């Protein structure tokens, strides 16, 4: 049938196939997260907590899970042309600056971005781990300037908890799919506990994907 060289070439192909499969099994267990903020949303702070141009790879291990965090901050071009690269991303980590509600509107631009990403045809069966960073600054900003400046028809008292709860509720809106789940969490400066809630969010998303695959969801 095959000559000496053809058989040796087939053996080489089989060795390559084995190597590719082994590399596939090794990389399949890794969790892939897409960090997607808007300028000064606290991307640099959160990525520093977890741990020239192009996307920035940040891989960290936590409790028998190897998380891979993709920080796209160089591609200033239209998103839709590279959004389809992240089809099989486990979760989308969205950062929002709570303190940047009045000063610029920056919050409106953040809501418009979240609306675009959450309703993207590629990101349908992908949960969003929303992070509302810089709540410590918002703590005194709400007491000086009312929230109504940014969002009209607020029709509520101007305190800390309710204002943050209303922003969370508005961010939980623009979700037209029942398979999505938004794990909203408010963080301030440094906590050293954001890696835990990310792990808690991811393992919930994995359980949800497993039950969907089984046919209970």
């Amino acid at each position: 049938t095959l000559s000496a060289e053809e058989r040796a070439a087939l053996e080489r192909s089989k060795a390559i196939e084995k190597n590719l499969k082994e590399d596939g099994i090794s990389a399949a267990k890794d969790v892939k997260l897409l960090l997607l903020g808007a300028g000064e949303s606290g991307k640099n702070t959160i990525v520093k907590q977890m741990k020239t141009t192009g996307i920035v790879e940040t891989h960290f291990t936590f409790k028998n899970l190897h998380f891979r965090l993709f920080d796209v901050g160089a591609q200033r071009s239209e998103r839709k042309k590279w959004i389809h690269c992240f089809e099989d991303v486990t979760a989308i980590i969205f950062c929002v600056a709570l303190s940047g509600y009045d000063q610029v509107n920056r919050m409106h631009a953040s809501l418009k971005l979240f609306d675009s990403i959450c309703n993207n045809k590629f990101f349908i069966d992908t949960s969003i781990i929303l992070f509302l960073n810089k709540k410590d600054l918002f703590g005194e900003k709400i007491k000086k300037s009312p929230l109504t400046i940014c969002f009209p028809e607020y029709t509520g008292p101007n305190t800390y908890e309710d204002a943050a709860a209303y922003i969370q509720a508005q961010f939980e809106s623009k979700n037209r799919s029942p398979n999505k789940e938004i794990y909203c969490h408010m963080t301030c400066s440094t906590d050293t506990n954001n890696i835990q809630v990310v792990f808690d969010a991811v393992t919930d998303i994995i359980i949800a994907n497993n039950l969907r695959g089984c046919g209970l969801y």
């Binding site: 099994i25 028998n64 899970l65 393992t203 994995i206 359980i207 497993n210 039950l211 695959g213 089984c214």
Partner: peptide, 19 residues
Amino acid sequence: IDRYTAVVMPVHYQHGTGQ
């Protein structure tokens, strides 16, 4: 039992694939 493994032990279950 398979569904029990999927819920309780999700990280070793993957998405219904793996070794």
